[PDB]
Paper text:
Single-stranded RNA bacteriophages (ssRNA phages) are positive-sense RNA viruses that have shown specificity for gram-negative bacteria by exploiting host retractile pili, including T4P6. Acinetobacters have type IV pili ([name]), which are involved in twitching motility, surface adhesion, biofilm formation, and natural transformation in gram-negative bacteria. Our study delves into the interaction between [name] and type IV pili.
To investigate the recognition mechanism between AP205 and [name], we employed single-particle cryo-EM to obtain a structure of the AP205/[name] complex. The two copies of Mat exhibit different conformations: One Mat (referred as outer Mat) extends further to elevate its apical domain away from the capsid shell while the other Mat (referred as inner Mat) is embedded deeper within the capsid and has a larger bending angle between the central and basal domains. Within the [name]-Mat complex, the apical domain of each Mat specifically plugs into the groove formed by three adjacent pilin subunits within the [name] (referred to as Pilins 1, 2). We also observed that the internal cleavage site of Pilin 3 at Ser79 is located at the binding interface for the apical domain. This cleavage allows Ser79 to move ~13 Å away from Gly78, allowing its interaction with β8 of the Mat.
Residue numbers in the entry:
A (entry chain b): 147 to 195
B (entry chain b): 1 to 98
C (entry chain BV), H (entry chain BU), J (entry chain BT): 9 to 78
D (entry chain CP), E (entry chain CT), F (entry chain CQ), G (entry chain CS), I (entry chain CO), K (entry chain CN), ...: 79 to 147
Write the structure that this text describes.
């Protein structure tokens, strides 16, 4: 989960750390975290053309 | 051998994130703030920001050993274990027109 | 005194506002651990039935109905 | 009861009929299970070679270390 | 007093039926409450993930520290 | 102590004398038990085929989900 | 909320990456805490042997018997 | 009722200071003991392979992956 | 997986080639193992006459009666 | 409220006072049964040593030292 | 090792020297055994006609069904 | 910390060296304990058969239901 | 300001040191007190069992119902 502030402030009113998507609410994706970002341990090889 | 790589298309908007209700009733950067329910914000905006996060995480680098966020603000976390596997070197061949 | 009672009022509000440790994660994991244990014990009977050559209708299962729907 | 038909609705048994197919034991959470993990399935699969492994559709924080994908 | 229906008119319980619905325990003031807060509503909301959070409609000067919005 | 006779008055053991009768592990509350459930009975029964099931006479409020029968 | 980083700035946890380092859970007062203790910290220390210990930087009279060492 | 409330505060401090025994001994020993069951099950394969006279490459091992790597 | 080469990195199999060298099975903890014993190893060695014995590098408090050699 | 915490202590009182059955019966039986196998395992060697007429010093035993001297 | 002398002090074997004597294998518990059975012994005696029977000094409740002699 | 020499002066362990003597875990109050029960002791004694029991020297009003004996 | 030494000489705290002694909080009038009650005192005593009671040496007409003993 960590942090999900990867997205920009599109559609948000920027006020300091506050991304006001509405006149009455804002989010802080630095804390507003609701995505489970996943990472695996892959295997890969190099092929020369 | 192994290397850590992102898992594209395996991240979902679980909903364990609370948008912050503003006490001031306006766009004041400061002031007391609340923990409000996720349902208040539109689903279209939620999907847009999730798509932006996915593009930032996966599309920025497919197979690399990037840096993990010191404060956790990573944009796609992957790793290389042991000595990173080198490109079989780009075979430049030169011919000059006399 | 009036100050003493408001102090009690402050104590009551502080105590009741304790953070819940999100016990849903604890309870859910325990139930999952239970279910896999029962189906884990089911591995013994199915393995021999395959190794003996009996059919699906001919394999005896000593399964007991579970409240967690297995 | 039997591999073909059992005494519980949430339990399904995949009994192999040929030497080139696998066996699976799958259980579905419900009834007395948590509402959050309702309708999810945990399966025990057996390859025709004879190796057992576990998998489940529950959230990662609910997944036991012995059943992690 | 059950979750679906209780013995008091001033208490309502919102019971989730699926893994995505959120619980809510709402209580509306009255009877022996102050006239200024005669119809204010006090609720506890529980996210489906298992986190309990507080919200109320009373004035800020009446909100306690724990639920100080 | 033994299946035929136990060292506690509140515990009784039903031992099967044949292959066509069930076994029961019956215990009645008392001593330090709650006054509401002071004289309630709680038993664990086993079918002759080898199946164990749980039942009790206590109120549905006090019944665990594993013995709600 | 993960062990690496949580949703609250006043709480941090040191996770042991090896078998020769101790684990720690640190909580810094603030927000609605008293101003006199607005910047003092309370921590839980876990020795690698598996023993838990507690220490804090608050004054003696405000310190209960639970973390006297 | 001032003195009434800090009785709970004393109780909360009393319960929060409950001794936690070193559970690391219990978990690790169980993990170590489980490894032997995984490790000891291969003794039959190795003993048969040696007595059969087959080489290392000819000794089929029915080892299944374990989360403890043992 | 074979005696010469195995499908798991934490398992080592020493196959003897003569009547004087001892057979050995080596297993290393890891992944889901405890951090304290994350890099310890437990081994079963087989003498040329055919005697199986066990030893381990874990602490004395982690050694059961089976392998407390 | 001094009633919630007091009930908790009683619950702690109830949980700590659980009746522990005699686990000595299970452990002792397992040790004897396991030793029963080891002592019964050397029967085959004794029989043929008797039947082949070999002396006590001339009968080789494949017995190994164990944690239980039985 | 040998019938005359073994590698363990707690195990002794009575090898008959004629056709009119019996064979017996005796093992004494201890070391890693339970303290309640610290010095008890279990014997496998062989009749001169070739019949094997098992006996032990362990308490009745700990005796297995096979050595209930 | 071992049973022979415990890590606390108030905790004493009676280790049975034979099959006929009982084990005892004696815990004496003190330090942070109440002044009224400052010098009382709480013990857990185990019969050789494997039955555990509790005894305490505190007054009846301070004795819980478990250790009322 | 501790139990051993108070902020003022007019307040005295008797802290028990054993399980058989009683606590006492005695306060002698003075300074701004009336001339009639210039050298009187009021004491709060606590029995070792945990009972508090009030005693006063002032005249009957100045004694309230709380400390009318």
């Amino acid at each position: 989960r960590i942090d999900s502030s990867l997205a920009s402030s599109a559609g948000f009113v920027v006020a300091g750390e506050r991304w006001y998507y509405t006149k009455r609410h804002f989010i802080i994706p630095r804390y507003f975290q609701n995505w489970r970002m996943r990472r695996r341990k892959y295997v890969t090889g190099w092929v020369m053309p | 051998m192994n290397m850590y790589k992102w898992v594209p298309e395996s991240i979902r908007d679980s909903g364990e994130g609370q948008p912050s209700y503003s006490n001031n009733g306006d766009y004041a950067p400061s002031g007391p703030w609340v923990a409000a329910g996720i349902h208040t914000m539109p689903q279209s905006l939620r999907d847009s920001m999730r798509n932006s996060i996915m593009v930032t995480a996966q599309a920025r680098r497919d197979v690399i050993g990037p840096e993990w966020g010191p404060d956790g603000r990573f944009t796609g976390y992957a790793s290389v274990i042991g000595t990173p596997d080198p490109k079989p070197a780009d075979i430049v061949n030169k011919f000059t027109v006399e | 005194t009036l100050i003493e009672l408001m102090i009690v009022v402050a104590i009551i509000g502080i105590l009741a506002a304790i953070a819940i440790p999100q016990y849903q994660n604890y309870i859910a994991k325990s139930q999952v651990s239970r279910v896999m244990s029962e189906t884990g014990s089911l591995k013994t009977v199915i393995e021999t039935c395959i190794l003996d050559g009996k059919t699906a209708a001919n394999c005896e299962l000593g399964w007991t109905n579970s409240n967690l729907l297995g | 009861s039997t591999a073909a038909v059992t005494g519980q609705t949430g339990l399904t048994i995949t009994y192999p009929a040929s030497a080139t197919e696998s066996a699976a034991i799958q259980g579905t959470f419900g009834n007395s299970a948590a509402i959050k993990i309702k309708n999810q399935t945990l399966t025990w699969t057996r390859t025709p070679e004879g190796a057992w492994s576990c998998a489940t559709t529950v959230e990662a924080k609910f997944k036991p270390a012995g059943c992690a994908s």
